[PDB]
Structure 1
Amino acid sequence: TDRYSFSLTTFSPSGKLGQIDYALTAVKQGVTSLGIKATNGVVIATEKKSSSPLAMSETLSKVSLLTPDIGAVYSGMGPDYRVLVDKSRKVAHTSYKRIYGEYPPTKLLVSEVAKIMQEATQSGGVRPFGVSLLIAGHDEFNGFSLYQVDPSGSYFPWKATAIGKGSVAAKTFLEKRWNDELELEDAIHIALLTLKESVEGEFNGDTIELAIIGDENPDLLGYTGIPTDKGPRFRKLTSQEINDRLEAL
């Protein structure tokens, strides 16, 4: 049956919450991922990793679209991301796409997935999720915005940040290379450059999954002729397109 209705996150005696502390260890075991916020886009970036070359990378995904205006990319455990991406799409429809008829702002959706976090830092028979997500997006009133949702269930707004095993070195590189005007194309050159120093294995347009939240493409809209709506702002970069910008280093 179920008799597990007691929390397994409990207070530790010198203070702190022991499960959430541990779970943050599990975040820093995984891949390295970063995000740079420009003035007209946000770029997010990650490295693919397989068991062998026999795995395909084509069917693999690590950057997902939650809404067309808001994407996510993680560093931490593969399993936990996989379910939590799906719960994120679900609450985004059920609590703002049926109620206010449209996709939710980035501040609002972030706040909902931090509450998904929160109810596995608590309740019985559950431990914390073992990912930390960047949830980058664009809304119409807080601009481009990059967030970091964490195992604690807090969120922080950021302007550029990194998470994963190369986090310590990555952000110092990014502190010194940040500037208060970047274009999205100029943003890319930073993110690739940094992600090249955290890879030591192979480097290709097939092994770096790169995503932009640029500006609107009506070629992914699927249709034309309602000018009220404007196509996916989210646009995952194909292997061919990424490869040119790799040579551009």
Structure 2
Amino acid sequence: HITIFSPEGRLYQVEYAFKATNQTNINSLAVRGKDCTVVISQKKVPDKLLDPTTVSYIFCISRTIGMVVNGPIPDARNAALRAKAEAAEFRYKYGYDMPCDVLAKRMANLSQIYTQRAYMRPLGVILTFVSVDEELGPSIYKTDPAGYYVGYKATATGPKQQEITTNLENHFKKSKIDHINEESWEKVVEFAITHMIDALGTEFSKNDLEVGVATKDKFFTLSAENIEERLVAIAEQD
């Protein structure tokens, strides 16, 4: 209860905050290419009265940085905005476009500050940033509400975390490298959908999903149509 230390120093509002990130109910996964990066998220559209265009958990922050978030849409659109502008203000104030790993710092920084000074309740969302910067290439860093980020060679956010995970882990103990060997994104994409389908004991149509790709400085969201064609691709080859 409230934002100041427990008897075992663990102020739960931060802890509670987490369940809510998860609670949304969507699964987000991400992996590195070789000259590209990719994230998978599900696109469950219940109400037959909405419009799938307006739905999404992935947005174009920068010309090259995209973001996915397993978390409640209102709080996300916020984080989206601030971040979206921090980079905007950055390029201006410093001469060069802001990289993945950094945004995630002021971002975690920000969520830490809130938390400690009490100027608002933490947002209940986990942000997963992606891109490729010409200093560390395929970059992937994640941030949580307890104001904190780190690095992933490929990650996942969702109700079923460790499952999506373990698969990749096993696929990694064998592929032995710390990323996905392959030149084309289409091909990598195929790979992830693959590793997710296998991971849910579930199948997806051409609208049941949501995916994004980070290239050599030209990040773009995968749309309804192009999305299906990868299912075509990965049907026989399986």
Which protein is richer in helix relative to its size? 2
- Check if 1:246 corresponds to 2:231: yes
Map residues 94-109 of structure 1 onto 2, 5 A cutoff.
94=89, 96-109=90-103
Distance 1:23 1:74 in 2: 14
Q: Is the partner of 1:206 in helix, strand or coil?
A: coil
- Structure 1's unaligned 5+ residue stretches are 1-6, 217-232
How many residues matched? Answer: 225
Shift, 1:125, TM fit? 5.2
Paired residues of 2:109 and 2:148 also in contact (CA < 8 A): no
Distance 1:159 1:145 in 2: 8
Distance 2:229 2:186 in 1: 12
Report the residue type matching 2:181 in the other structure. Answer: L
Distance change in 2, residues 1:244/1:51 (3 Å): closer
After TM superposition, where is structure 1 displaced by more than 6 Å over at least 4 residues in a row?
none
Paired residues of 1:80 and 1:129 also in contact (CA < 8 A): yes
Paired residues of 1:75 and 1:163 also in contact (CA < 8 A): yes
Shift, 1:28, TM fit? 2.2
- Check if 1:68 corresponds to 2:63: yes
Distance 1:165 1:26 in 2: 11
Farther off after superposition, 147-156 or 110-119: 110-119
- Check if 1:26 corresponds to 2:20: yes
Shift, 1:137, TM fit? 1.5
Distance 2:231 2:75 in 1: 30
Map residues 139-178 of structure 1 onto 2, 5 A cutoff.
139-178=133-172
Shift, 1:105, TM fit? 1.6
- Check if 1:193 corresponds to 2:187: no
- Check if 1:182 corresponds to 2:181: yes
Paired residues of 1:64 and 1:72 also in contact (CA < 8 A): yes
Distance 2:30 2:151 in 1: 12
Q: Which residue of 1 aligns with 2:9?
A: 15
Query: 1:50-101: CA deviations, max 9, x gaps?
Result: 341221111223111111111100112111101110011111111x221123
Report the residue type matching 1:69 in the other structure. Answer: T
Paired residues of 1:120 and 1:129 also in contact (CA < 8 A): no
Distance 1:176 1:187 in 2: 17
Give the TM-score of the pair, scaled to structure 1: 0.83
Q: Which residue of 1 aligns with 2:120?
A: 126
Shift, 1:199, TM fit? 7.8
Paired residues of 2:66 and 2:131 also in contact (CA < 8 A): yes
- Of 50, 54, 57, the residue aligned with 2:52 is 57
- Structure 2's unaligned 5+ residue stretches are none
Give the TM-score of the pair, scaled to structure 2: 0.86
Paired residues of 1:74 and 1:131 also in contact (CA < 8 A): yes
